[PDB]
Every structure is written in C-alpha cells, then in structure tokens.
C-alpha cells in the first residue's frame, strides 16, 4: 500500500523489467560504446536473474 | 541407405514406431505373472532411447 502510495505505478512482474533494462543497458552499451558498455553487459546480465529464478522455480529450460 | 533400396518395407523413424509399441504393449496382455508385464514394460522402456537420446542431446528433455 505505501509502495502504491509511494509510486502508484504498477509494473509487470517477471522478466518484463529484466530483459527490458538489459537491452536498454546493452543498447546503452551500443550507444556509449565506452568501457562501461562491458559493465552494462555485465550488469544487464544481472537482470536475467528473475527469468533464471523463475525458470528454476517453474522447472523449465531457461536458454530457450 | 542400401538397406533403404533393398527394402520395399520401410519403418518411419524419429520414435514414430516405438510409441506405437510401448503404448500398444498396454499391459495385462502379458498378465500371467506380470513378470512379462514388467518385462514388456522393461522392454517398452528401452524402445524410446531414440526419442530419449535426442531430446537429451537436442533441446528440452528426453522425458518432457
């Protein structure tokens, strides 16, 4: 409730935010093309947790 | 492939014929001690190794 009070913007769960930011980070890697592009591709890699977590918790194949 | 052109009979591959056995081996047809009903079950379970080893080797599951 306070979170809805704090920001009342409901967000799609699951990997919806994960793979989104990942691209946008790697797109930011493509854009910025600096050194921190690699940290992005390192950080954007962190987003996939929820898919992996959920693919674990469902017991499916993640790589597909 | 010489066994293809010597054979007017041909058996469809990729586990088409094995499920036509393991299922159509539906038991109590060897009801006597069930040892055949188990042995046919045992034999039924070695049939699918081609559907197994591949979905094993290839994507998803030899089982699922």
Swiss-Prot record, chain A:
The modification Phosphothreonine is found at residues 33, 62. ADP binds at residue 14. It is found in: Cytoplasm. ATP binds at residue 14. It is linked to Neurodevelopmental disorder with speech or visual impairment and brain hypomyelination: An autosomal dominant disorder characterized by global developmental delay, impaired intellectual development, poor or absent speech, and brain abnormalities including hypomyelination, cerebellar atrophy, and optic nerve atrophy. Some patients have severe visual impairment, dystonic movements, and seizures. Belongs to the TCP-1 chaperonin family. Component of the chaperonin-containing T-complex (TRiC), a hexadecamer composed of two identical back-to-back stacked rings enclosing a protein folding chamber. Each ring is made up of eight different subunits: TCP1/CCT1, CCT2, CCT3, CCT4, CCT5, CCT6A/CCT6, CCT7, CCT8. Interacts with PACRG. Interacts with DNAAF4. Interacts with DLEC1. Component of the chaperonin-containing T-complex (TRiC), a molecular chaperone complex that assists the folding of actin, tubulin and other proteins upon ATP hydrolysis. The TRiC complex mediates the folding of WRAP53/TCAB1, thereby regulating telomere maintenance. As part of the TRiC complex may play a role in the assembly of BBSome, a complex involved in ciliogenesis regulating transports vesicles to the cilia. This is T-complex protein 1 subunit gamma. It comes from Homo sapiens (Human).
UniProtKB/Swiss-Prot annotation, chain B:
ADP binds at residue 14. It comes from the Eukaryota. ATP binds at residues 14-15. It is found in: Cytoplasm. It is linked to De novo genetic variants in nearly every subunit of the TRiC complex, including CCT6A, have been found in individuals with a broad spectrum of brain malformations, and clinical phenotypes ranging from mild to severe epilepsy, developmental delay, intellectual disability, ataxia, and other features of cerebral malfunction. Component of the chaperonin-containing T-complex (TRiC), a molecular chaperone complex that assists the folding of actin, tubulin and other proteins upon ATP hydrolysis. The TRiC complex mediates the folding of WRAP53/TCAB1, thereby regulating telomere maintenance. Component of the chaperonin-containing T-complex (TRiC), a hexadecamer composed of two identical back-to-back stacked rings enclosing a protein folding chamber. Each ring is made up of eight different subunits: TCP1/CCT1, CCT2, CCT3, CCT4, CCT5, CCT6A/CCT6, CCT7, CCT8. Interacts with PACRG. Belongs to the TCP-1 chaperonin family. This is T-complex protein 1 subunit zeta. It comes from Homo sapiens (Human). The chain holds residues 398 to 461 of 531 of the full protein.
């Amino acid at each position: 409730c306070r979170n809805v009070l704090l920001d009342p913007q409901l967000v799609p769960g699951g990997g919806a935010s994960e793979m989104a930011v990942a691209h946008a980070l790697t797109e930011k890697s493509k854009a910025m093309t600096g050194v921190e592009q690699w940290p992005y591709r390192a950080v954007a890699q962190a987003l996939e947790v929820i898919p992996r977590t959920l693919i674990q918790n469902c017991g499916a194949s993640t790589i597909r | 492939v010489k066994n293809a052109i010597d054979d007017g009979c041909v058996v469809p591959g990729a586990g088409a014929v094995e499920v036509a056995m393991a299922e159509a081996l539906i038991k109590h047809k060897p009801s006597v001690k069930g040892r055949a009903q188990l042995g046919v079950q045992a034999f039924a379970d070695a049939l699918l190794i081609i559907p197994k080893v591949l979905a094993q080797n290839s994507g998803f599951d030899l089982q699922e």
